[PDB]
């Protein structure tokens, strides 16, 4: 008959990797998570306790609870025609900090520094990011760069 277990179709997902089997390094236990941190979920096959379900692999959530060896994460799961909040208790071996969040915090403090600097001059900081604008005019010279003419090539077997 059909089979839909807790770890169905997790063969390659919960595989470890090439050549980083064995125990996990100590930075995963030395990292500190706080309520409100944004964390990514990537399960570790070596640690069978506190594993997330396969749906939450590669999902990003917010910490809401900190325990002895685990972390409570809130995920938004798409069920039917709406999202539900799902509270997960995951051991920290399946959890890493999101890098986008800290890079946004560095952008926040950089914008704060820019504003605090240019408040003393009133030079219209323009702190917003901008997309890749179309490139403006330029004058390209041919000194040592005379154009080299190209032509399409005939057909050849090349076996």
């Amino acid at each position: 008959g059909k089979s839909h277990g807790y770890r169905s179709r997790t063969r390659y997902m919960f595989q470890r990797d090439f050549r980083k089997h064995g125990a996990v390094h100590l930075s995963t236990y030395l990292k500190v998570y706080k309520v409100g941190d944004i964390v990514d979920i990537k399960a570790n096959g070596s640690i069978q306790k506190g594993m997330p379900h396969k749906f939450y692999q590669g999902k990003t959530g917010v910490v809401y609870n900190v325990t002895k060896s685990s972390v409570g994460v809130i995920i938004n799961k798409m069920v039917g025609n709406r999202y539900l909040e799902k509270r997960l208790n995951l051991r920290v071996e399946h959890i890493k900090h999101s890098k986008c969040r800290q890079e946004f915090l560095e952008r926040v403090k950089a914008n704060a520094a820019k504003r605090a600097e240019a408040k003393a001059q009133g030079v219209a900081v323009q702190l917003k990011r901008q997309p890749a604008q179309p490139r403006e005019s330029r004058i390209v010279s041919t000194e040592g760069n005379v154009p080299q003419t190209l032509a399409p090539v005939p057909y050849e077997t090349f076996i």
């Binding site: 390094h25 030395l30 500190v32 900190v66 685990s70």
Partner: protein
């Protein structure tokens, strides 16, 4: 032709961690040691790292960060000459004195020394540093014996007992101390006190000096050269303990030189790498001689 390893084997081989390859760290034990209750967010967990080499005892108080471990304070056995112990720098009493020294040193540098005086009158009883009320809790530290065998009588537990009597709170039971009778599950305090004060080497010195004098001259030669008899080591250990409680302040050495002064001679001595162009010249000369028809 026999001791050969395939390219597939060497490409699929996963090296262990470097400390495991060196054979110095048990990462299974390290994970249980250095990990913290995550609700104690940045609270460091402190290890009393006790290591025994030949001719030295190393005691360290170590916390762990992601970039590496950080030392609060260290105490070595080769600076016990500051306190009056010159011989037997790896014995059980030296381990006890090193534990007491690092305990008092950390308590002084933390300010927890006027409180938690520890055990001054040493008598061999088993007790932990209890928390005094209306005040701060005692400094908590856990042993890291590494790959060393837990064994009734091992001097890692002498270092433990020294640190505990120094006023540090290190959790332990008593069934690994010497004098713990097995069938009658109790601790004998007088044998432990004798081990603290070196009774187990003084009795050997007596029962060797009475019959076998050639061994008593081969070993214990330093005691003979410094007129140390068997009964005196008890009082020099007591004086070393009270001097340790007097000042554990760690006066370091004067180093006789500078860092760059040592580095110049060692840089002169260390072998260097062979660069790419001279490597190509080397193989070209090897072609011109070996393959150049001699």
């Amino acid at each position: 032709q026999k001791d050969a390893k395939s390219s597939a084997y060497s490409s699929r081989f996963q090296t262990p961690f470097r400390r495991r390859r060196e054979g110095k760290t048990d990462y299974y034990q390290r994970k249980r040691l250095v990990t913290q209750h995550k609700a104690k967010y940045n609270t460091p967990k402190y290890r009393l790292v006790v290591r025994f080499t030949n001719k030295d005892i190393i005691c360290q108080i170590i916390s762990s960060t992601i970039t590496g471990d950080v030392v609060l304070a260290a105490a070595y056995s080769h600076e016990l000459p500051r306190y009056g112990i010159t011989h037997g720098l790896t014995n059980w009493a030296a381990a006890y004195a090193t534990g007491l020294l690092i305990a008092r040193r950390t308590l002084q540098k933390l300010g927890l020394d006027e409180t938690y005086k520890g055990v001054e009158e040493v008598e061999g009883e088993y007790e932990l540093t209890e928390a005094v009320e209306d005040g701060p809790r005692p400094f908590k530290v856990f042993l890291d014996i590494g790959l060393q065998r837990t064994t009734t009588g091992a001097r890692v537990f002498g270092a433990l007992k020294g640190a505990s009597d120094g006023g540090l709170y290190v959790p332990h039971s008593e069934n690994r101390f010497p004098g713990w009778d097995f069938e009658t599950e109790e601790i004998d305090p007088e044998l432990l006190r004798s081990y603290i004060f070196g009774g187990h080497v003084s009795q050997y010195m007596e029962e060797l000096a009475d019959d076998d004098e050639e061994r008593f001259s081969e070993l214990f030669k330093g005691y003979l050269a410094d007129d140390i008899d068997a009964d005196s080591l008890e009082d020099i250990y007591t004086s070393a303990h009270e001097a340790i409680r007097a000042d554990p302040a760690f006066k370091p050495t004067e180093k006789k030189f500078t860092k760059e002064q040592y580095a110049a001679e060692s840089k002169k001595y260390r072998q260097t790498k062979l660069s790419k162009e001279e490597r190509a010249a080397r193989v070209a000369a090897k072609i011109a001689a070996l393959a150049g028809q001699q």
